[PDB]
Amino acid sequence: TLRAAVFDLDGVLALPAVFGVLGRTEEALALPRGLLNDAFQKGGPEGATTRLMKGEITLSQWIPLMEENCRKCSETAKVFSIKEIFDKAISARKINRPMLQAALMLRKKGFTTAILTNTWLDDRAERDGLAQLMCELKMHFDFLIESCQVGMVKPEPQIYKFLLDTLKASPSEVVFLDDIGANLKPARDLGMVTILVQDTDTALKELEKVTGIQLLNTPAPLPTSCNPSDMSHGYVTVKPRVRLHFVELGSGPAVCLCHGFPESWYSWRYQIPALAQAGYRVLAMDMKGYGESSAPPEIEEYCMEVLCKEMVTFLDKLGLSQAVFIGHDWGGMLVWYMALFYPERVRAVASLNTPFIPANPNMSPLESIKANPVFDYQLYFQEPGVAEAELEQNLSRTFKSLFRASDESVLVCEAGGLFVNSPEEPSLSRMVTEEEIQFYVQQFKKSGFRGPLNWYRNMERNWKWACKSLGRKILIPALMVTAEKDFVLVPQMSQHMEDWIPHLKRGHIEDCGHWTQMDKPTEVNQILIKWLDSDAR
Amino acid sequence: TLRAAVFDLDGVLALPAVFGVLGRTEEALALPRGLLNDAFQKGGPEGATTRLMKGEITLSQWIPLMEENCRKCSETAKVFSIKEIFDKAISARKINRPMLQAALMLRKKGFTTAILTNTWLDDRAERDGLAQLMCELKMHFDFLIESCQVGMVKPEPQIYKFLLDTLKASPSEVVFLDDIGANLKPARDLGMVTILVQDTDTALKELEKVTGIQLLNTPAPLPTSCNPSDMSHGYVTVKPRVRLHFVELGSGPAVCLCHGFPESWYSWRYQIPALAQAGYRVLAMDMKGYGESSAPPEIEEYCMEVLCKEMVTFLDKLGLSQAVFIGHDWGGMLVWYMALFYPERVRAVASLNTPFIPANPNMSPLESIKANPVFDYQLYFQEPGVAEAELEQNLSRTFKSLFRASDESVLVCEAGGLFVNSPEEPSLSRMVTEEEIQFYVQQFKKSGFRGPLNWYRNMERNWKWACKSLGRKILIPALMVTAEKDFVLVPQMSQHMEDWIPHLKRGHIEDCGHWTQMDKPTEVNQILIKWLDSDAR
Numbered sequence A, B: 001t002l003r004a005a006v007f008d009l010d011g012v013l014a015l016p017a018v019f020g021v022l023g024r025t026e027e028a029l030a031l032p033r034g035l036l037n038d039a040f041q042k043g044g045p046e047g048a049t050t051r052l053m054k055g056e057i058t059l060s061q062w063i064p065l066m067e068e069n070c071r072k073c074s075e076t077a078k079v080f081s082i083k084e085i086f087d088k089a090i091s092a093r094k095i096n097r098p099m100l101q102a103a104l105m106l107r108k109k110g111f112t113t114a115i116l117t118n119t120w121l122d123d124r125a126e127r128d129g130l131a132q133l134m135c136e137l138k139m140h141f142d143f144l145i146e147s148c149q150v151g152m153v154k155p156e157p158q159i160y161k162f163l164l165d166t167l168k169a170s171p172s173e174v175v176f177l178d179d180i181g182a183n184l185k186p187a188r189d190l191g192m193v194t195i196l197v198q199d200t201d202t203a204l205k206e207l208e209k210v211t212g213i214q215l216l217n218t219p220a221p222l223p224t225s226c227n228p229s230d231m232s233h234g235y236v237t238v239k240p241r242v243r244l245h246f247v248e249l250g251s252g253p254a255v256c257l258c259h260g261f262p263e264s265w266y267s268w269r270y271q272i273p274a275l276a277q278a279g280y281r282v283l284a285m286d287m288k289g290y291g292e293s294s295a296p297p298e299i300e301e302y303c304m305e306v307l308c309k310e311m312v313t314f315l316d317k318l319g320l321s322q323a324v325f326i327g328h329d330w331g332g333m334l335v336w337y338m339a340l341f342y343p344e345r346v347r348a349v350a351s352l353n354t355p356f357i358p359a360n361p362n363m364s365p366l367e368s369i370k371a372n373p374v375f376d377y378q379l380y381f382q383e384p385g386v387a388e389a390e391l392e393q394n395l396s397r398t399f400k401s402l403f404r405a406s407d408e409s410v411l412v413c414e415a416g417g418l419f420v421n422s423p424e425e426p427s428l429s430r431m432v433t434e435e436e437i438q439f440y441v442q443q444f445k446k447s448g449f450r451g452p453l454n455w456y457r458n459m460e461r462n463w464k465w466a467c468k469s470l471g472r473k474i475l476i477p478a479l480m481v482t483a484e485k486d487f488v489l490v491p492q493m494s495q496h497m498e499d500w501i502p503h504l505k506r507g508h509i510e511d512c513g514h515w516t517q518m519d520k521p522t523e524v525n526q527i528l529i530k531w532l533d534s535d536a537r
């Protein structure tokens, strides 16, 4: 019975193989057939290539040794840069997405996965390209065994016993995929299930046949999520009693993600890996009042002016002159005001669902809010302690009731609460796992709902502050993402935004409810990456 | 008696003034005198400029309003891009270093300092330049009062009462510096000491006369240091029982600072702000065994192979494909081995004091170490518990005894310890304050010296591992910084490094002891920044 799956890198998880370049160069340059493949293989287990693969020498030391082997092979046959050929071959090699997806599905079903590869110590000036590829790939496997790190190469029998010992599995429990028949043989001899990989489709057909798990023709997978315990956690004190916590991933321009109510940095779990992979340094906040960030009890600690000043202090303390600010729900309203009051500090601004809403100077914000009845539920949030009591009463019930797709609603507010005619034990939304709900439950045990609710308790102060910006326009790069099925933050509420943000760009997600990030993560990622790459560097 | 100092930005803390561009443009373009200065000032307290300065409109909205004022002024006089003129004026404006140094000296002597400025909300595509300038400047002051944020401008009397209220000082306690006589007048009326700033030298002469503090002709100041409570603190779990803590500052290429024995991330306190200001994202580690990082008790948890693997995991979890690695003492030996075993992950490598030392395959590492007697003191570190007992006995004594310049030594090892004929209450080195020593004392109360000493307890394992690299060369960008007066890690010990690192660059610091970073911080900063900018992007 199979319990582990092992994959080769070149020609299996990454294509085109760095090998099918020696053959192409030969054909493109009309050289005698196999000449470059000969020079690459010269000396066998004693030659330059075996030394490179075992980590005895680096790639840069190997380049002149391969060049010398090439002249010797040309001399024998009786008949230009090796560096250039390999540089081009390495940069053209991309992850084989269907093969990676099959490895991901096997691990999700309980398989132990590993990459076993004959590789080198890359010290070329262009080494970052390969470092990036290996870093993206390795995260998805339990083990990465590199020949140059273990000082053993395939087909040597000891690398296979080393593999078995690493997996803590007997050979019959292992399926082993390789594109080189010679490197597959010792695995076969030990009793492992082997797959000679030529075309991906046939290899996966063989793989699904042996595992009894569907790998081909599967539904589109969700983007990579985050495991909290595996993230880098950052903490910045913005003032004596207030610290802000964030999760941080990637390199490049800073992108600051600002969640809504009643959420977490974790609401961005499907965005963080995708944006980091796209070339950005992601800073996913726990907003003031939430998770590991401070939660002072005072209502005025949560007015927009205070919240924005603290996010500016956050950038100051991290040594960031700017960040792109992306917000959802309350976080989306905060980001529009960051763009209006601190344009110097905002590289670009994007909001999911929340439109930019200016103050009406001729109407009280209480009059104005009552003219938009979808917000009647926010009146229930006004009286201190009332909504805290209901929402803190059963956290699992609170999160399972709230985090539901547009057609899964279980929730007027003069019924006497948000959960009056709601189930005491709601079903789990198709958007979340029980484990994800328990993460939110755990986060909210620290400070509960007082700080989060206080974000709604500053209408008058926020209106006075917003009035200072009535003569301004938002002229920095901006994106408004509407969600078809958000019944509170409806797409039509954003219709006047071009009057204030003339250069505004848009995105729109059909069949998407309020919880945009987890409702339509692939779509959110596609929209944000496209906009960041075109408007935020 | 003076207790606070207030500085203007344009023409005082930053030069050349964005004003002395209107006059220059007029002369360069042979326009009627004062025409552009007229159009800029049009409408007085009712005009476009006052609206901009109060934050009613942004800079991008003001540009076409100023253009219109220019055509009206040209029409009156009977006689090209405003955007281009202001873009050039803003980017040419640099911090007035002697003025900043005087503000720094006053604060160090107990003065409350503030910047009071008539400024704008900058939403130009080039706004980052100014954001960078303001971010560097503001960190050095207690308060930054911006006209566009408070909705008041100088010379309006209310901005001065607001200033006094912010400082919590009576007018007679405040000295106020401005380059505009009109903006100085209301401060004078209230009873504040005022300084009309034309040339910096005369202004500081007036400033030293009123404060009784020497500001002009002072010794060269030390670089900016770090206040631990003001830094962003990061934590990454690299394996179940091990987490690594780091301090993080700045944006740009990742630079990972690796301290020595028995040190802290704080040993880089003079480097962190300078490198971040230079355009780098600094990650200053607490190395395994230290400060807030985990300190497992097992000797083998501190072998070079394990330490390097964990630093690779650290990069993986942060989503960094590479970092520049800069090390000192044990950290310097770790960085050379990172370059040798993980070149793909090392953008560039630099070591302070520690030379790259290969394994001698024909000699036991114990034989080899005894052939270099300066290391005899490391034999004392071998027996578990012996050096822990002496070093943990009195932490203040330990750090004050160790952290001394080359001519301040108070420390053979068969005397029966490092502090045998050493003072029980050593004097404070000219390199450190009592507060800095107490920071180290506090850090070492958590785990003490077991983990740190374990770095020396893996000679045999490290030799076996290092032997795998004997056929390699370090061919990625590398810098070796020697310290004239380090009597253990002597400059001559690095003489063979070019044999292993042919493209090696060097730096050398005269009259510098073992504690390079705090001994010669300005010199260290100059050397590292120059090398990073030329070899690490």
Ligand SMILES: Cc1ccc2cc[nH]c(=O)c2c1
Residues within 6 Å of the ligand: A357, A358, A359, A360, A365, A366, A368, A369, A372, A375, A463
């Ligand atoms: C959430 C919210 C929504 C709409 C408005 C409209 C006008 N004024 C407000 O304060 C307001 C607040």
Ligand SMILES: Cc1ccc2cc[nH]c(=O)c2c1
Residues within 6 Å of the ligand: A261, A262, A377, A402, A411, A418, A488
């Ligand atoms: C429509 C509606 C009703 C209740 C709630 C309660 C808590 N949070 C929400 O976002 C919400 C939205």
Ligand SMILES: Cc1ccc2cc[nH]c(=O)c2c1
Residues within 6 Å of the ligand: A304, A333, A357, A358, A455, A456, A458, A459, A460, A462, A463, A466
């Ligand atoms: C600036 C702004 C815009 C909308 C709202 C809505 C409800 N409450 C607010 O405080 C608020 C503040």
Ligand SMILES: Cc1ccc2cc[nH]c(=O)c2c1
Residues within 6 Å of the ligand: A401, A402, A403, A404, A406, A409, A411, A485, A486, A487, A488, A489, A513, A514
């Ligand atoms: C705040 C808010 C806004 C919209 C929705 C829509 C559907 N379900 C919700 O819980 C919800 C909550």
Ligand SMILES: Cc1ccc2cc[nH]c(=O)c2c1
Residues within 6 Å of the ligand: B357, B358, B359, B360, B365, B366, B368, B369, B372, B375, B463
């Ligand atoms: C600190 C140190 C210094 C020199 C050497 C020389 C040869 N071998 C070693 O292990 C060694 C270790």
Ligand SMILES: Cc1ccc2cc[nH]c(=O)c2c1
Residues within 6 Å of the ligand: B261, B262, B377, B402, B411, B418, B488
């Ligand atoms: C020469 C010498 C002697 C003792 C010590 C003790 C602790 N740490 C050192 O670095 C050191 C260096």
Ligand SMILES: Cc1ccc2cc[nH]c(=O)c2c1
Residues within 6 Å of the ligand: B304, B333, B357, B358, B455, B456, B458, B459, B460, B462, B463, B466
């Ligand atoms: C690789 C290397 C080089 C020098 C030394 C010196 C002392 N101890 C070591 O373990 C060591 C390890």
Ligand SMILES: Cc1ccc2cc[nH]c(=O)c2c1
Residues within 6 Å of the ligand: B401, B402, B403, B404, B406, B409, B411, B485, B486, B487, B488, B489, B513, B514
């Ligand atoms: C490890 C080490 C190396 C050199 C020195 C030089 C002077 N003083 C020291 O304490 C010291 C410690």
